[PDB]
Ligand binder design. Structure first.
Ligand SMILES: Nc1nc2c(ncn2[C@@H]2O[C@H](COP(=O)(O)OP(=O)(O)OP(=O)(O)O)[C@@H](O)[C@H]2O)c(=O)[nH]1
Ligand SMILES: Nc1nc2c(ncn2[C@@H]2O[C@H](COP(=O)(O)OP(=O)(O)OP(=O)(O)O)[C@@H](O)[C@H]2O)c(=O)[nH]1
Ligand SMILES: Nc1ncnc2c1ncn2[C@H]1C[C@H](O)[C@@H](COP(=O)(O)OP(=O)(O)OP(=O)(O)O)O1
Ligand SMILES: Nc1ncnc2c1ncn2[C@H]1C[C@H](O)[C@@H](COP(=O)(O)OP(=O)(O)OP(=O)(O)O)O1
Ligand SMILES: [Fe+3]
Ligand SMILES: [Fe+3]
Ligand SMILES: [Fe+3]
Ligand SMILES: [Fe+3]
Lengths: 479, 480, 481, 480
């Protein structure tokens, strides 16, 4: 018999016994102890929510969309085997997030182990494998009409993409299934739909996107010898508004100036603690925080706990790390100086991130300073805001249909919709913070920053005339 | 005080003066005029009326002004000022006609092209009539108001100045910020917007993406060019662009909905045909028509959405033409939507030319075999200006800001200082074409005329263009 | 192709072309011009909502429940014909409400025409018939696999119950009795009509709703009970079901029976009574009908909506001056003043017969206090209100069937004692509100003295404000100390 | 300058710098790592929320109510000193909850240390003292016009009641109403309840049926027995009974959920087995156990929900028993629910007897021969008191009311004056029985023992009784 569970976002979800069996494992219940928004909780006090319930919701919506397409179009021959596989993918899609979610794969691992190219998705695949094997799920999958050989590939492929037609999990006549959980084509997936609704509910922001409606106007059509999901022509407006809502949530919440500084501070503390924390892995081998990603039995035990483990410890080897975390409780955070963007089409490459603190200290502002500041005193945080496909417009990669010809797929350009849409679909934000908190050093930092902006032909800080009044007239372009 | 439970704002308190204004035929009239006019016939939640909107705007006016006063005693905002602002907010949409914006936006312009009339002008006149016919002046005095000065101040909040130096007679320059609460002439950020965002969304079935409460917490008065004006915090600039995005989005989805607009035009059409034969008793018994009731307020008091059902239920054969249009709305034989398009380059379609556009569509000679030829009277062309409230201008360039480090120092934030993902332009035109003939044969024809007319004038390709007129879209070199 | 419509309560509903065809008729679109809560809008300024959108929602939820039972239990053999019929019933279930909804069938018609036993439901049946015939729907029903003979009966029967211990229904057999429990549940009162208006009225009123209809649907199930297949809820839901009827009673207390909402209802009713004689409405073949007689002809009743309020208000006919003056008094807010509320004691039920006489009794009281003014019986209004759990004195949960996790086909009963000691002792009571037509300071004081005496005179409960309003009278009663 | 913070329940709260200074301490930020609903998260997956944000909201609402009374009634002379003190009390009121909130003070401490009478409130007082002293707050209180001698007593007194005629040393009798805001000893109507109703509902997935904002608009201070206390308007009496109904309803659906409670008992069980082998560093480095950390606040500061994962992740073999219970929660091999029952007549089960009830269930001799016999250690009996917050009393009989006609005159409203459909009693007991042995054979047995035990003690028939134990239910004459 089905099991019913009450999510505050989606209401009463039914869970197929196979799903319940996957959910009730240490690998999945692990997600109860990892917050969705990482350090965001320390700015938005509503945002206590964890991956566990997000993972449930994504599984649910995956089920909704695939099941809806099947009702709408029997010709597709979507089996309850396909449905289950899509649900399972959705359910397990973020199994591989680290402590504090995106802080881990986005800040920490890149710093701790620059050699590796590792993502939360790759983790999810490996963790899924470990979940299946350590809990004897293969027999249960068979019991409910699945074929582990084919289907475990199909599930993995939904999550990370592919391990001519690149997929071994399903044929070309069911390519639409790959667009549900994690849409490689345009980015419109149920992952987004859940976290919009969920993050908004818990943050204290209202969500401007109706996933239910998009489902009612979704439909599979042939596009280039392949069956893919298409939206109705009228929905094009709502789809641009979906990616606006995404970018807006990043601006207000996910990339919040203090949320990000807390993320960097927690990352900093992890880096200092990494050497002295051991985690028992497979066959008892000892793994560090940074190396737990290599073994899943170890990574199973690596959660937000590691924060409090560091905070509460008395090991003097951890004193450096513990002091950073104590500074977060007391709220002696590194101080925000200002924000800026590049101009023209000057993209700042990732390689150069290391060097930018040096450049800020190196500026010679024509103003008398009390204090000189070294490059180690500065933090520069570079942030790429986009519409999910770097410089591309994702709507140019969406297929549409008309009321008059619902099997005929078409394209809608930007010009066909509106002149009030974005000109570009990607940019960079550069936040500068200063490690020295005091009145004297903050004034100095501001002068260095606003000069550095003029030095590199960046945009004038919004507060620029106030914070560095002596420096802003210098630039001819700012008048 | 009197407490009243609005579903949007919760439990509002109402000052006895306000209650006394509310309980008048001129104000209770707003119970019988829907917010979204013909929108109710597309969004079945949107039953809501001006009455409750008017309450909410009054409330939020009170919130903002009272908040500024707490935050900044130096401004010397009196409870007299507060009441006046509340009253303005309360009465700000007293002058909407039947079906709200349909009246001042479609009907009056067609019925009486000579007049320049707006719902605001109506509100001023209706306010005057309310005060005089209900003996409010004594009550205003009783609660510390000065009718001479203050009734001007209230009117001025609603319509702007009643005539580069200081244009207002109601209040001096050191209280200019008060004029920015109810109806903000500078940039358009007002509590009118804040209520109807929340309200329309609640009733429509759309979620609202703008937090008015938050903006209030980061609002503040500063000196700007020898004048004290409301300023928002530097960080809020993002949310302010998102306010006008939310506005434009609501127009796209709801207010300018293709069918909502065709129902508006159909009701307007029926009013035009009924205008000659409907009398409304005015002041001293003089007889006024639907189009002329705006001249007298005693008559206009009785002019509400009722006029729809009056026409529908009538048996006067003089009204048969009008009644038949309205019966066609019940049965849902609406004029059929053909498609939408925009001009290209910077080709603005002037208002003057609106009359002529049906002629142009019929005039197109599509290279396709048609069953039926269609005359210009068969077409309706509906031109819609979508903007950020200041025609082609960026309203954020007309907002003043402050910093945490210097909260009395006002500043400007340009577009470039915020984001590269903002809109390039801040106004555009949408051209919807509909056909009066509903049948399968005439609709196909209409589509061919339309898609040709688009290629003929170098307009954008209709989104559905390759489907509806497959033979015509390859013709244009620019569409490949 | 289906048509999609965005209701703020239920989201994006799909509408089957047959339903759309029924919706787009003058008989149905009529419901756009009748408010859900009648005079409640004049107290809760959110409550602008109309029957139209309620009717949509009830149709939708009817579809949800029946479609859900079918997925859960294929053995029931619920056809898409059955589904459509249930949706249509739900959609059309309140087609027959009058102007200001329950004011019409509940106050006005009983006063205007005491001879008739008429309800909004009976109206809906007749109006449904008129809708079908005047719009040629029968052919369209056939086109989508319905059988008008059988099914139009089934639809009517869902709305009003049986059209007259054997099986009473001619529309469907006993093996599909569960279908009759969806739209309007004669057994216990748990229906989708309630579920919509809870959610809807709350949304528009400014009150939060404490009942989850979606959840009850997930734990609904058909079982055999006494040679008949009926809907049963899971044993654990029993708590939520008592809370459903609590939520109902709570909404009546706060909103539907609000002291001022009711006085405005009586005032509008009063104005209609005075206007009835002089308002004509064109009916079938042009025959002239009055407000009170429009219920006899549906072509006339089609044109009878909340409009009739504004028609009276805006008129200049001097025959309507009495009616127009009452309605003008509502604009200006010179309402009849509330004096207080009371209940009977013991097991003293006040019969409907006696309602006429109660104003006489209040004036007749001789309070031992010096009054400036004597008041006549015509000056008083007494409004008697029956608050119940939908089955007069009965506990509706004693008429619900339940199932267990361990035996989901075996139906059972759950008594009150098996659930909780904190449940209600009784399931019906009476509320008596007294108002005075004379508004002034002097007459209101007098009215209060008459009322609080009348309460002591008939061994009713002490008014909550009693010691304040009539301080000289409350010590008189030995039972109040 | 004030600090603004965005709570999803209450919106944008302003925080006074003194409050911010209290919030940013290890003693307060500790509450980020303690869930509101303890083990409820393992049944309601929305309920991730923690005490931290609850504590914020209670502080906020405390501010709202006290500030509202002050505006409504200047005669009370409520100082911004009083306001701050009330806010601080509200903010810090649940500073002393243990790991998994009510599991700690309600299940664990009573079992681990039966000698002590300890509550989360007593903890909050001690933790407040530790917060103030370890962070040098006293100087800051003085800086914002407080008097630490008087006011720190007043704050503590708000939380726990009197620290020893008028019982309070913190404030005089003419400000007794202030003690009714944060934690209302008289009737239980406090802002603590108002927040968690709204908050728990938001996160659980249940809609809340109580409007705190409205009650505030109709709240008022009147004299009652030589003392100034908060009174509600006569009409609100209905809503107040509905407040305590909503409370009881939330306990039934959520807080006392059969599985939520079994997970609480299982976590408690694991803590008991782990208690001996877990050390926590306290003041001057002294070693404290989980059960003894309550004696020292420096230790208790580090005692949070963490202790769950500490046990789960450990490899110490001394903790193997505890770790195995917690692993059984992940895998979902929970102790199985057998059924629920209530006593009859006026048979109250005293707390003393709780220990003995498993013995009694095993001791029942059900007249059908059972293939496995079960020992008393195999059973868990969970006794739950559901009340209206004052044991057997009606809390509305301890509320004061006022009338529109006489707003300074306080009165009483009995049950009979309101409704015949109200509850007959205001307290009852629920007895849940679970079995530690999970298997098919032992569960059948357990059911037979339970349903017999019910008939043996003249308890109510289990709702599922005829199904689970069909052979036993006809035995009882009273069940037919
Ligand atoms: N048909 C109908 N639609 C309504 C009603 N109320 C709101 N609507 C909405 O208005 C939308 C569009 O109106 P329609 O009558 O369908 O006009 P259309 O969409 O241009 O035309 P078709 O879809 O071809 O019939 C519908 O899809 C409904 O969601 C109603 O009473 N009847
Ligand atoms: N101080 C503090 N702020 C919090 C906390 N939790 C969330 N916040 C929010 O985080 C926001 C910003 O963090 P702050 O600590 O104020 O950092 P900041 O604003 O950059 O620094 P200041 O302006 O100097 O206070 C605040 O407005 C709060 O609403 C907390 O525990 N302490
Ligand atoms: N229980 C309730 N919950 C929420 N709102 C209510 C409730 N009862 C009434 N309202 C609404 C209707 C109005 O918007 C406002 C005032 O109603 P109410 O409390 O009955 O006072 P009232 O003005 O009718 O009587 P009074 O003159 O006795 O204050 O609150
Ligand atoms: N754009 C936003 N919309 C809604 N809520 C927000 C937004 N930004 C922040 N919040 C929330 C998170 C915080 O709890 C609160 C205040 O945050 P924020 O406005 O960023 O001020 P801050 O304290 O971080 O910087 P500052 O010290 O400059 O005010 O509101
Ligand atoms: Fe995800
Ligand atoms: Fe307005
Ligand atoms: Fe109904
Ligand atoms: Fe609390």
């Amino acid at each position: 018999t089905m099991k019913v569970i009450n999510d505050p976002i989606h209401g009463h979800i039914e869970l197929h016994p196979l799903l319940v069996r996957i959910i009730d494992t240490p690998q999945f219940q692990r997600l109860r102890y990892i917050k969705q928004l990482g350090g965001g909780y320390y700015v938005f006090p509503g945002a206590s929510h964890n991956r566990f319930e997000h993972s449930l919701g994504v599984g649910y919506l995956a089920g909704c969309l695939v099941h809806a397409l099947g009702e709408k179009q029997p010709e597709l021959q979507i089996s309850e085997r396909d449905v289950l596989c899509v649900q399972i993918a959705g359910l397990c899609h973020d199994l591989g997030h680290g402590p504090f979610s995106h802080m881990f794969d986005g800040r920490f691992i890149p710093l701790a182990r620059p050699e590796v190219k590792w993502t939360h998705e790759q983790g999810s695949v490996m963790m899924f494998e470990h979940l299946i094997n350590s809990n004897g799920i293969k027999p249960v999958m068979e019991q409910y009409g699945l074929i582990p050989e084919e289907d475990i590939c199909f599930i993995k492929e939904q999550i990370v993409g592919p391990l001519l037609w690149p997929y071994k999990g399903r044929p070309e006549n069911k390519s639409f299934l790959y667009e549900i959980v994690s849409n490689k084509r345009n980015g419109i997936d149920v992952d987004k739909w859940d976290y919009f609704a969920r993050d908004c509910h818990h943050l204290g922001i209202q969500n401007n996107f109706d996933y239910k409606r998009f489902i009612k106007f979704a439909r599979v059509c042939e596009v280039d010898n392949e069956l893919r999901i298409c939206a109705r022509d009228k929905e094009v407006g709502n789809l641009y508004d979906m990616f606006h809502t995404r970018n807006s949530l990043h601006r207000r919440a996910y990339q919040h100036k203090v949320g990000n500084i807390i993320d960097t501070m927690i990352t900093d503390a992890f880096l200092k603690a990494d050497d002295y924390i051991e985690i028992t892995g497979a066959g008892g081998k000892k793994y560090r925080i940074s190396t737990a990603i290599d073994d899943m039995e170890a990574y199973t035990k690596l959660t937000d706990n590691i924060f409090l483990e560091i905070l509460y410890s008395t090991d003097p080897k951890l004193k450096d790390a513990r002091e950073i975390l104590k500074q977060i409780e007391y709220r002696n955070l590194f101080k925000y100086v200002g924000e800026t963007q590049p101009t023209g089409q000057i993209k700042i490459k990732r390689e150069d991130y290391e060097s930018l603190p040096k450049e800020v200290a190196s500026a010679k502002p024509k103003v008398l300073l009390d204090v000189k500041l070294k490059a180690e005193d500065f933090i520069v945080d570079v942030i790429n805001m986009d519409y999910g496909m770097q410089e591309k417009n994702p709507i140019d990669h969406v297929s549409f249909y008309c009321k008059t010809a619902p099997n005929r797929a078409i394209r809608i350009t930007k010009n066909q919709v509106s002149q009030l849409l974005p000109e570009k679909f990607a940019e960079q934000l550069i936040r500068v913070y200063c490690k020295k908190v005091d009145r004297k050093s903050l004034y100095a930092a501001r002068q260095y920053f606003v000069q550095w902006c003029a030095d590199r032909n960046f945009t004038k800080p919004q507060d620029g005339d106030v914070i560095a009044p002596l420096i802003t007239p210098q630039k001819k372009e700012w008048n």
